Each structure stands twice: as structure tokens, then as C-alpha cells.
Amino acid sequence: IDESKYVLPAGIKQCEGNFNLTEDGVACYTINGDDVTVYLDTKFAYDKATLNAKGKKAIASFVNFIKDSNISSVTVKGYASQGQTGSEFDIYNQKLSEKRAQAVADYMKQLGLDSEKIITKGFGYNDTLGGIHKSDPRNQRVEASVSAPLKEAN
Predict the structure, then answer these.
(1) Residues 67/131, Cβ–Cβ less than 8 Å
(2) Strands 26-32, 13-14: parallel, antiparallel or unpaired by DSSP?
(3) Looking at beta carbons, which pairs linking 63-66 to residues 24 or more positions away fall under 8 Å?
(4) Which of 38, 40, 66, 110 lies deepest, with the highest CB count within 10 Å?
(5) Which pairs of Cys residues are joined through disulfide bonds in the record (predicted)?
(6) CB neighbours of residue 38 within 10 Å
């Protein structure tokens, strides 16, 4: 006798298997029961902390979900690839990754999200993606995930 209809995050599609092994910026969702979780994987060109159009489209939809879910805070994590076999550039890439997270967060603020709701972390070329080489450009990225109950349709 149930009639309630729940609605999916706007402009975001369900995550495919290994959704982070895309070399494109993406935002996707998974459902676990009645709670939805949205992921953001924004990619960057080599040595760049600038956003591209794909990244910006993804972020905008990510933010639209945060503002609609009345979500409290989002942690924005930046990463880098390890381009060279030693540790000469570990601090360099740590800073790079921080700059990437800061880029993502700056754009979120342009979109009408408040700076207090945003926490940024850089990781350098640690936590590189599983299954690929550490120097793969897909490691050059910012990640974030938020969760919220599924909204009833209205």
C-alpha cells in the first residue's frame, strides 16, 4: 500500500564499475538502502591546478546536490601523480595537490556555497589509485563524497 516516490540527485547518474578509472571529470551516485552517496572525481592536466569544463560541470552538479540536501560540510581532497621515481618532488606534489583542492573549493564558492561548509586536504602522490601506475594522469585529481537520505518527490 506504499505510495511514496523518491527522487535521484539532479544531473548525476549512477556510478559504473571502477568509475574513478575514467580520465574525465565525473560525479556519480550509489544507493545503499534509502541513503544516496554522491562522488566527485575531477581530473587535472599534468602540473596544472586549473579546472576544465568537464570538471566545472561535475562540480556544479555536486554543489547543487549539497545545497538541496542541506548537507553540512564537504571534505575536498587533492591528489597528484608521482612522475619521477624518487622523492625529489614529494613536497612539490603535496603543494600541487593542495592547490587542486583549493581550486575545486574556490569554484564551489562561486556557485553560492559558503566557505565554512568546505574543508580542503592535499595528499600529494600518496593514496594513488589502485590498479594503475603511480604516474598515471588519472591520479592527478580531486575527490569528495557526501551522503544524504533520498528525498521524497515534490
Answers:
(1) no
(2) parallel
(3) 63/108, 63/111, 63/112, 63/113, 64/9, 64/10, 64/11, 65/9, 65/10, 65/12, 65/38, 65/146, 65/148, 66/113, 66/117, 66/146
(4) 40
(5) 15-28
(6) 22
